[PDB]
Design an enzyme around this catalytic site. Sequence first.
Site, PDB file in Angstrom:
ATOM      1  N   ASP B  56     -40.299  -2.159  -5.627  1.00  0.00           N
ATOM      2  CA  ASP B  56     -40.725  -3.531  -5.859  1.00  0.00           C
ATOM      3  C   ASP B  56     -41.184  -3.709  -7.300  1.00  0.00           C
ATOM      4  O   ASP B  56     -41.922  -2.880  -7.837  1.00  0.00           O
ATOM      5  CB  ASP B  56     -41.853  -3.892  -4.895  1.00  0.00           C
ATOM      6  CG  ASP B  56     -42.022  -5.386  -4.726  1.00  0.00           C
ATOM      7  OD1 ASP B  56     -41.187  -6.008  -4.039  1.00  0.00           O
ATOM      8  OD2 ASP B  56     -42.996  -5.939  -5.276  1.00  0.00           O
ATOM      9  N   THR B  89     -38.725 -10.501  -7.745  1.00  0.00           N
ATOM     10  CA  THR B  89     -39.778 -10.164  -8.695  1.00  0.00           C
ATOM     11  C   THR B  89     -39.223  -9.433  -9.911  1.00  0.00           C
ATOM     12  O   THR B  89     -39.676  -9.660 -11.037  1.00  0.00           O
ATOM     13  CB  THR B  89     -40.848  -9.320  -8.009  1.00  0.00           C
ATOM     14  OG1 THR B  89     -41.245  -9.953  -6.787  1.00  0.00           O
ATOM     15  CG2 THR B  89     -42.052  -9.188  -8.903  1.00  0.00           C
ATOM     16  N   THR B  90     -38.253  -8.543  -9.706  1.00  0.00           N
ATOM     17  CA  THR B  90     -37.664  -7.832 -10.835  1.00  0.00           C
ATOM     18  C   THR B  90     -36.817  -8.763 -11.692  1.00  0.00           C
ATOM     19  O   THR B  90     -36.769  -8.615 -12.919  1.00  0.00           O
ATOM     20  CB  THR B  90     -36.829  -6.653 -10.337  1.00  0.00           C
ATOM     21  OG1 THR B  90     -37.588  -5.900  -9.383  1.00  0.00           O
ATOM     22  CG2 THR B  90     -36.447  -5.748 -11.492  1.00  0.00           C
ATOM     23  N   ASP B 393     -40.663  -7.892   1.854  1.00  0.00           N
ATOM     24  CA  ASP B 393     -39.703  -8.711   1.122  1.00  0.00           C
ATOM     25  C   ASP B 393     -38.688  -9.340   2.065  1.00  0.00           C
ATOM     26  O   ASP B 393     -38.390 -10.535   1.961  1.00  0.00           O
ATOM     27  CB  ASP B 393     -38.991  -7.873   0.063  1.00  0.00           C
ATOM     28  CG  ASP B 393     -39.890  -7.515  -1.100  1.00  0.00           C
ATOM     29  OD1 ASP B 393     -41.092  -7.849  -1.050  1.00  0.00           O
ATOM     30  OD2 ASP B 393     -39.393  -6.900  -2.064  1.00  0.00           O
TER      31      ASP B 393
END
Lengths: 154, 536, 260, 52, 116, 150
Positions: B56, B89-90, B393
Site C-alpha cells: 500500500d 494511493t500510489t 482496499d
Amino acid sequence: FSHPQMPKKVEDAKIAILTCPFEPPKPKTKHKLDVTSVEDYKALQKYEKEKFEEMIQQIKETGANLAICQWGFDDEANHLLLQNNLPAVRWVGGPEIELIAIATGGRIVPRFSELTAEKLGFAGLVQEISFGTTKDKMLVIEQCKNSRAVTIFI
Amino acid sequence: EGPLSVFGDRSTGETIRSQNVMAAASIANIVKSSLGPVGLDKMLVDDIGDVTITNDGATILKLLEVEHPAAKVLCELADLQDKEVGDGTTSVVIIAAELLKNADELVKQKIHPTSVISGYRLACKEAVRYINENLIVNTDELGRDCLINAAKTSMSSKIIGINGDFFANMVVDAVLAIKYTDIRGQPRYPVNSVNILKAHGRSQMESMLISGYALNCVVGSQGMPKRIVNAKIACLDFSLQKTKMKLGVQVVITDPEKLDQIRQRESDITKERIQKILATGANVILTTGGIDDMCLKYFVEAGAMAVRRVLKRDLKRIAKASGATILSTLANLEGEETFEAAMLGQAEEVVQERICDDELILIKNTKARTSASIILRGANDFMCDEMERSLHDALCVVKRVLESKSVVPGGGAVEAALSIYLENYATSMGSREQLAIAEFARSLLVIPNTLAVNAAQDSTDLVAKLRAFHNEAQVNPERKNLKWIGLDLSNGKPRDNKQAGVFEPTIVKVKSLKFATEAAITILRIDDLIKLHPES
Amino acid sequence: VVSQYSSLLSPMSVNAVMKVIDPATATSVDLRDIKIVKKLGGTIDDCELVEGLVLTQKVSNSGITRVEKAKIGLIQFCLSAPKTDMDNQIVVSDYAQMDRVLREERAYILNLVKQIKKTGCNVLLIQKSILRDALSDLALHFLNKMKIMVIKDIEREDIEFICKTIGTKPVAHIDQFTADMLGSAELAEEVNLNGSGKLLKITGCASPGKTVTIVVRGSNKLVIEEAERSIHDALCVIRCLVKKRALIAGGGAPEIELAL
Amino acid sequence: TNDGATILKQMQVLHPAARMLVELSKAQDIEAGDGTTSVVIIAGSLLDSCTK
Amino acid sequence: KKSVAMHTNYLSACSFTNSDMQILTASGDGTCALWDVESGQLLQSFHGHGADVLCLDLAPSETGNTFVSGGCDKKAMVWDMRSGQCVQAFETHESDINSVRYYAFASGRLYDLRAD
Amino acid sequence: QPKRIENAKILIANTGMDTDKIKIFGSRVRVDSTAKVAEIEHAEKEKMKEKVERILKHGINCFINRQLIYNYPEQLFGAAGVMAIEHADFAGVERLALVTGGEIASTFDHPELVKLGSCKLIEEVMIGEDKLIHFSGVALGEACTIVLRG
Ligand SMILES: Nc1ncnc2c1ncn2[C@@H]1O[C@H](COP(=O)(O)OP(=O)(O)O)[C@@H](O)[C@H]1O
Ligand SMILES: Nc1ncnc2c1ncn2[C@@H]1O[C@H](COP(=O)(O)OP(=O)(O)O)[C@@H](O)[C@H]1O
Ligand SMILES: [Mg+2]
Ligand SMILES: [Mg+2]
C-alpha cells in the site's frame, strides 16, 4: 485608608486599635460546622450577616471616628465601615500598632466585645499623604496629647 | 548573515524550486516500484526489528521519516486519498510528483508559475469532464460480474492477487451483507463494519467469511458453556463488580451491629442486577466493563455465556446486528431498576471456536440484521497483516462501485485517452496555457509508463501503440470502441480492458486528479524558503 | 493562492460581510461575527457558506444524528449527582441508606431530564464543566431514551456566538429552564465529510441575527491556512469599503499618479 | 504564505528597524487588512531615498 | 485536569489553592497570578517582586485570601486577595529562597506575623 | 444582557457573585441522603437569587462588579434587563466611581444609603479591531480615558 472613597483627613480622631480581623469568628481548634438542612443554611447565612452588622455597630457605639486593625478584613466590613462614616486602615504592622497605641494614649483591644470608650486613643489629625507622581500613600498620625513616641521622616 | 539579519538559512529562485521538485521526486521514486500487477511489495524495518511487508502506498509513506516540507505534502496527500477514497494511493503520489516535475521545466523556460497553475487548473477541470462524458461504464449493464472484476483488479499487485478468484467472491459477499438503507432511500454500505481478524495457520484458501460476527474475545470463566444454540444476547455497557459508593458518599459506623449488613449490600446489589438480567432468559451477556469472580459464578450456575472487556465498537455492531440494545445502566423511566426481554438480541448460534492454538467467539447468523466478518489465515503475522491492508482496499473499491454505479477501464486506459484529448484541446485555449495544458497531458502518461517498466517491457513502444489506438478513437467516429484499450502486462501488448474485466471506480481517478493537481499547485506556488534555525 | 477559486470565494466573502451588518446604518464590521472553520479533506471548491451554526463537537448520542424542527437549549449547569458549592458528604449508617441514596440520585437525575423534556426541547447543548461531571452516563441514558440529541463540552467562549446565531438564552438553573429559552431551528444534523471528520450543522433559524459561518476545506494543511488568510483579507477589504465609502483604481495607478 | 504580515511575523528579524517594519505590518493589517506588503515596500523606499 | 497552559513564561510553582475552586500560579517574571478553575479568567496579577518567584504558600486554615511568595529578591512578602496589595514583607533572607513552609511560616528562618 | 442603555443608573460593586460561599470556612454539608443535598443546592441557588433581587431593588440599569460574575447571576441580570459588567479591576471600579459618582458597595441591605452613578448613554464602540464599552454623558467626569493610535 482601605476603601478608596473614605475621607483622606480626620481631625480630633477617636482612634480604636484592634487586632481582630473584621471577619466572622473562627475557632483555633480543628472545628467542623455541620449543615444538615435548609434551615441550617439559612441560619448560618443570617449568622454571618448579623456578625458583620454587630461588629460594625459595636465599633460605632464607642464613639470612635477612626479604626485601625492589624490583620485586614473583607469587602462587607469595608463597605459597612464606609457606610457608617468610620475611616479605617488595615494590615497595620505589630510594631506600628504598638507605636500608635503608645502615641495616641489608647489601649489595644483584642476583640470587639471588649472595645469601650475609655480604650480609644486620641489624635488631633490623621491624614493621608501623597508623594508626587508615585501613586504611593502614607498615613500620618500626629497632634497627640502627650505622645511618648516620635517618628523621624527623612 | 548579510543585511537581512535573520537567524536562519534562505533559498530563492531556481535553487528552492529544484529542491522542491527533487524532494517530490524522491517520494515518488520510493513507490514507483510498487505500481500495477507486476509491482513488488516492500519491506520496512522499524529500527527495533519490527518488519512491515506492504504494498500500500499510504502505509509506506506513513512509516517513512520525511524531513523536507515538500515531501511531507506528498506523504500527507497519500493519506488523504486513502481516507477519502481508499484506493489509488500510489497513483496519486506518482502523478503529483510528475505534475510538479514537468511544471518546473516550464518555469525554467521563463513561463510564469501563474500561467502554469492556470493551465493545470483548466486541464484538471476538463479531464474530469471528459472522463464523466466518454470513459464511464454504467455497472447496471454488467450485473454482479463488475463488482467481482473491480474487486479482482484492486487485488492485483497484492499478496492476495493470484488467489483473487476466491477472494473477490468473499469481499463482494461481505459488502452486500452489511448493506442498509437510510432516510431519503440511499443504499449506503458501512464498510469497516466488517470485522477482520488475523490469525496465522492454514493457507490463504482457508480464510473464512463468517455469516455473522467474530469477537476477538473469550468467555470469562472456564465453568461456563462454550456453545449456545438459541442465544439471547444481552449487551451491557457497565461493569458487573462489587458495588462501591461514589466519592461523595462515606460509610460511618456508630452502632457496630450495622456493619455486617452494610458489607452484605456491597455484593448483594450486583447479584440482584444479575438475577434480573438472567430472569428474562438471556444466554449470552457481553459487557464492555469487567466482571468479578463472584459475579461470574452466577453465569456459571445458570449455564450462560458471559464475555467481558468487549470493545465498544464491537458491542455496537453486535447489538445492531442481533437487534439488542446497549444499556449503560439498569434504570427505567419509573425510577426503578428493571430489565425487559425487549432488549435481548438473538442469534442462531454462539461458539467458542478455536483458531490456531487461540480461541474466539463466533456469533453466527444474527437475526433482524445481517452482518459479516472475515478471518484471514497466512504463513505468519507479516503475511496476515498485509492481507488485511489488501482486503481493506478491495472492500473500499467495492463500496465506491456500489455507491457510484460508474466504472472506468483500468491499465492506463484513462491516462492514455486523456493525454490525446488534452493535448488536442490545449491548442484551443490561451497562448501560454497551451504549454501548461499540454504538459498536463504528458504527465498523465507516467502511469502507463510505470506499469510497463515494472514488467521489464518496452515502455516506449507500448505507450506509443496504446496512444495510437486511443488517437484513432477520438478522430474516427466509428472506432469509438477503442476507448477501452489499456495495457495487458502479462503478454506486453494493448488489450481491451473493458472486455478483460479490468475496472476501477470512477471516483478513484477523479479524486486522484483533483488532489494531485492541488498538491502540485501548492508546491509550484513557492519561490522562496526561509528555514529558521532551531531554538535549542 | 486561491485565484482560480475567486469566482466562488468573492461572492462568499461579500455575502458573509453583508449578512453580519446592516448596510444602511453600519459604520464598522466586527469580523468576530464571521466564524471560519477549517476541515481537512476535499478541495477548496468545496468551501461552503453556512447560514446557521457549525460545531466541531461530537454528539454523545448514538443513533440520533438528525433532528427536524429542532428546539435547541443551552445548559450551563451539570446533569449529575447533586453537589453543593460547600464541602458535602453523605454519611451512611444503615444498609437501607445505601439503596436509598442510589434511588434518590436516580430520581433526581430523572426529574432533571423530565423537566428538560417537558419544555419540548429535543436538541441539548451542554457547556463544558470542570470540577463537576457535566453529563453523567445515567443522565445520558435517560436523555437518549427520550429521543433528545445531546452535545456536551461546549466551550465557554462560544456561548455568545451560539446565542447570537440560534437565538438561545443560556440557562444556569433548572428552575429557569422554560420553553421561551429555546432557540427554534429548521434542522439540526451531523454530517460526515467524505470520511475525513464530522461536522454538526444547525441550518435554518427563526432568528438568524447577524452571524454567519464559513467552512474552509482543502487538500493539505498549508493550502487551508492560506485559504483562510485570503478569505480574511477579502473580508477585511470589504470592511474597509464599509468604513470608508471610497474606491480607487488599482494596478499601480495611485502610486504613479502620486509620484507625478 | 503570501500575506506580508504573516511573512514578516514568522521570520525572526533581529535588527530593530526590521522589528519596527513588522509592527508597521501588524498595524496596517489591524487598520485595513490589505496592503500589508505595500506599506513595508513604501517604508523601505522612503528610507532608501533618505540615505541619499 | 485543568491543563490551562495560558502562560508566556515557565511556571516556578503551580500551587492549587486550599479552596477547591481556583489555582495560584507565579510566572518566571516574578509576578504571581490567580486563575479560576471554572471560568478560566485570570482574576488578578500581582506586580512587584521583579525577580522570579520560587515558592507559593496559601493560608493553612482554609482562608483562601492571603498567601506568601518568595523568590530571588531575597524577600518574603505576603499578599491579600481582597485588596491585591503586599500587606507584609520580610528582609532576613539573603539568598534565592528555594522552598517555604507555612506554619508564621518557616522559609529557607522562622518569621512571625504577629511581630514581624 | 442589553448592549445599550440610555439614562443609565450605575451601581458599582465589589461583591462575590461567584459561587458565593459563607465565610465560615469550617462549615460543611453532612446529611444522610442525596435529597437533602439537592435541597441544600437549591437553598444556595435561592441565596444567590435573593442577593440578585436585593441588588435589583436599588432600581438600576447597569451593574459593575469588581470580581467575576458567574452564569446564574448573569442570567438573572439578563432576565432583569440589566447590563452587568464583570471583572472590572480595582483601578476600573475606582475610575468608574470617579467618572460617574457612584459608590463602590459590598452590601445591599440599605438601598437608600448608597448613591448611584449616572450617565446619558452606554454603548459598545469599535476601536481598531476591538470592542470597548463607552460611557457617554457622564455625571462627574473626574476620570479620563485617552486613546492612543500609532
Ligand atoms: N489485471 C490488470 N491488468 C492491467 N492493469 C491492471 C490490472 N489490475 C490493475 N491494473 C492497473 O494497475 C494500476 C496500479 O494499481 P495499484 O498500484 O495496485 O493501486 P494503488 O495505487 O491503490 O496501489 C492501476 O491503475 C490499474 O489500472
Ligand atoms: N489583476 C491585477 N492587475 C493589476 N494589479 C493588481 C491586480 N491585482 C492586484 N494588483 C495590485 O497588486 C498589489 C498588491 O496586492 P496584494 O498582493 O493582493 O496585497 P498587498 O497589497 O497586501 O500586497 C495591489 O496594490 C494591487 O494594486
Ligand atoms: Mg490499488
Ligand atoms: Mg492584497
